[PDB]
Design an enzyme around this catalytic site. Sequence first.
Site, PDB file in Angstrom:
ATOM      1  N   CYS A   1      -4.937  -8.735 -22.243  1.00 17.64           N
ATOM      2  CA  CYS A   1      -5.167 -10.177 -22.073  1.00 17.64           C
ATOM      3  C   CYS A   1      -6.660 -10.566 -22.023  1.00 17.64           C
ATOM      4  CB  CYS A   1      -4.424 -10.692 -20.844  1.00 17.64           C
ATOM      5  SG  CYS A   1      -5.196 -10.220 -19.276  1.00 17.64           S
TER       6      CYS A   1
ATOM      7  N   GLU B   1       0.869  -1.156   0.000  1.00 20.36           N
ATOM      8  CA  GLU B   1       0.000   0.000   0.000  1.00 20.36           C
ATOM      9  C   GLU B   1       0.904   1.202   0.000  1.00 20.36           C
ATOM     10  OE1 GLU B   1      -2.929   0.432   3.041  1.00 20.36           O
ATOM     11  OE2 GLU B   1      -4.433  -0.671   1.878  1.00 20.36           O
TER      12      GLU B   1
ATOM     13  N   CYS C   1      -4.949  -0.782  -1.749  1.00 26.66           N
ATOM     14  CA  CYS C   1      -5.503  -2.063  -1.278  1.00 26.66           C
ATOM     15  C   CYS C   1      -6.826  -2.010  -0.505  1.00 26.66           C
ATOM     16  CB  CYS C   1      -4.454  -2.902  -0.550  1.00 26.66           C
ATOM     17  SG  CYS C   1      -5.016  -4.554  -0.095  1.00 26.66           S
TER      18      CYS C   1
HETATM   19 ZN    ZN Z   1      -4.319  -8.234 -18.527  1.00 25.58          ZN
HETATM   20 ZN    ZN Z   2      -3.576  -5.371   1.407  1.00 28.50          ZN
END
Ligand code: ZN
Ligand code: ZN
Lengths: 379, 379
Positions: B102, B70, B177
């Site tokens: 992707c 973080e 996070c």
């Molecule tokens: Zn990706």
């Molecule tokens: Zn975390």
Amino acid sequence: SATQGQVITCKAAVAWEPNKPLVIEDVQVAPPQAGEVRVKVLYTALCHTDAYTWSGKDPEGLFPCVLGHEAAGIVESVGEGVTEVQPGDHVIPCYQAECRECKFCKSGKTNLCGKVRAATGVGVMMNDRKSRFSINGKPIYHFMGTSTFSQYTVVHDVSVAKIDPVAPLEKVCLLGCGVPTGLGAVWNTAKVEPGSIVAVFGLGTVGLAVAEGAKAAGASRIIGIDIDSKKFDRAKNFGVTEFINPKEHEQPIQQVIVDLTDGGVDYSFECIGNVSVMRSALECCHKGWGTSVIVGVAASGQEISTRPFQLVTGRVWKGTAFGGFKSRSQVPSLVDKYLKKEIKVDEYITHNMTLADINKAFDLMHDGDCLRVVLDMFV
Amino acid sequence: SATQGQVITCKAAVAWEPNKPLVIEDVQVAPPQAGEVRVKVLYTALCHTDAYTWSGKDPEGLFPCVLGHEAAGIVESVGEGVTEVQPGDHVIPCYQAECRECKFCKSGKTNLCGKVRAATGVGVMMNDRKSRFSINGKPIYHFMGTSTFSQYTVVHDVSVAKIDPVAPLEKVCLLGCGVPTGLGAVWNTAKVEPGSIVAVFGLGTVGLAVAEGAKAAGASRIIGIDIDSKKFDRAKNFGVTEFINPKEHEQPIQQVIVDLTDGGVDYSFECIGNVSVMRSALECCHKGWGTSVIVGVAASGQEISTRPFQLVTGRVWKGTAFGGFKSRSQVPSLVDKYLKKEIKVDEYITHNMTLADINKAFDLMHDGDCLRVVLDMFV
Ligand SMILES: [Zn+2]
Ligand SMILES: [Zn+2]
Ligand SMILES: [Zn+2]
Ligand SMILES: [Zn+2]
């Protein structure tokens, strides 16, 4: 009519004791009270659920009882306050009620109406908390609020789906359980988009209806999974495009599916009711978006398990009850589609027997080879 | 710059082995290779995930390593091919990559990009499968692809979120996070509708972000559930409208929640990482639609269990990974909302300390009475 407001004496297959042959009895069917509909059952089909309650394995099983839930017939008479149906109307009795007014019905989130649930679950009617069936003046429990193994049955008005009178009653009786469960697992619960890669565990009636559902949804690959390769050939006609017999693989089935799907399936459907297979149906789903729908009913006191990482990593775990369809509002629509040739019904019926052949039909179902067994009640 | 193309010697808190205290060591931070970004980490916040790996309970833990995930910082330099960020840019290094190209990124169904996971999971960089950190010519494993406990870190470009240069970096480090995990569980994974009734299990940082997310989503009832009643008062400010301490009830928590909500909650969020509490969060959800979201990370081997009837009867079990937020596209958006004063960030910070105070900060996490602790890296 000649029976309107009177006790009816008819033929019914009675389950006196669990795991004993059914006896065709002479039964007294009381007239319908307020909010009730007395139905003349012309055709009834057997579902694994009737056999489950028959076996003795169902803790909610009440004996003596009249089994059956998959049927079609005609309205003989209606109780006080019944307006949506009238005598002579063609109908499908549904185990799942639709009051249109409760919390569940007033939301577009579910079909699980609970208006009559308590009564039906204890083999009685809401209005008086008693059975409409008797042999020697003693009560015979109802089953699933339907009891379709009797020529004449009393059901709540909220569980009576009014269908097209031109529709064949020996086919449409299936639109009361197995078939709508499968179609709806795909269309209502999962909401399978075109191009989706689908896995179907169990190629029985429901597994085959999930396959037709997926095909109509425009699924690019319908993978069928069954421990019996004999079930594969008939599945192709229902839209299954690939097959895997878990018995021919030393590694877990989910791992086999992941290898053939490049990470897993977009949607898996378990149509057996086996907790170990329910786990495998979840794990074979693709990371990030894969969704597993539990269609099969498992045994009481058995749990589904997985590592929470499976859900944190994007998989979804859900299930279906009567394929999310609202009985009264939607079963007639399913009949209209079948008549428009939009959905399959006939193809699931392999056997046509008579009510007196009930045990012979149960025999064929325990073996597990067959599909649906329609019984002609008035023969 | 004086460091472009050169190896940097800076300070880093290094975990030489499990459960032993962190040592502020001088480290060699090699320059970025192709597709890599070297970041000057100015502020780093402590998460329970850093404590978990530090303890030795993590099977994927590799020692010696530089923990921390973080943070907020400034780009010192970039490798060949890096075009999205440039030296001097204000950035948030993310443990969740976003290659934009992707299978997972090309779909709008998930934020789970897997491009850099094969390297990050083994504490290395993709380009040479080696660490960018050394002490006496010996490698120090990277952690979560971020290693924010080093004054300078080397991360994959696909994990670098470009943010507004006016955003306070001592505050926005949390947007890496905890805060997005809670906010997103509600907005992205669950998609909580106005008027919804919410249950929050765990009134820590993440639970409080879920409460804030639910409050912005227009939830009518936000039920907070924690075994520590001292956490109730502070939770109110974050949106929690009512509280339950399970120690104060002999009956299961799911039972208590249903009784107070008329059948259960619309959405439940488990922000503890306890598999038994995960089961309780599912079972306290309402029939027909109730959706439980697993936010908390359980320990390896642990399994979630329930009876399949729970899902058959309309319940949905799911999980969230970093609140379904796509790192590079969406972290800037969250910073904009914080600058617009549409989300809370400051309120999650209880302590500001220095890099030399890292062990004191971890002592504060152990007791768990605190929210977020921010370390000033350059003091
Ligand atoms: Zn990706
Ligand atoms: Zn975390
Ligand atoms: Zn209802
Ligand atoms: Zn059935």
